[PDB]
Amino acid sequence: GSSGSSGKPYKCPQCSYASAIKANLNVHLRKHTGEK
Numbered sequence: 001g002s003s004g005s006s007g008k009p010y011k012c013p014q015c016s017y018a019s020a021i022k023a024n025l026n027v028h029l030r031k032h033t034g035e036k
C-alpha cells in the first residue's frame with residue numbers, strides 16, 4: 001500500500017514527514033501542536 005515517504009532518518013511522530021536535519025523536524029512540529 002503506497003504510503004509514507006522513506007529516505008530521511010528523522011521522521012515525524014505525527015505524519016510521514018521526514019527530514020535530513022533534526023532542527024528542521026523540530027519546526028515542523030511547531031505546526032502540528034497548533035491549530036485554529
Ligand SMILES: [Zn+2]
Binds near residue numbers: 016017
Ligand atoms: Zn508531521
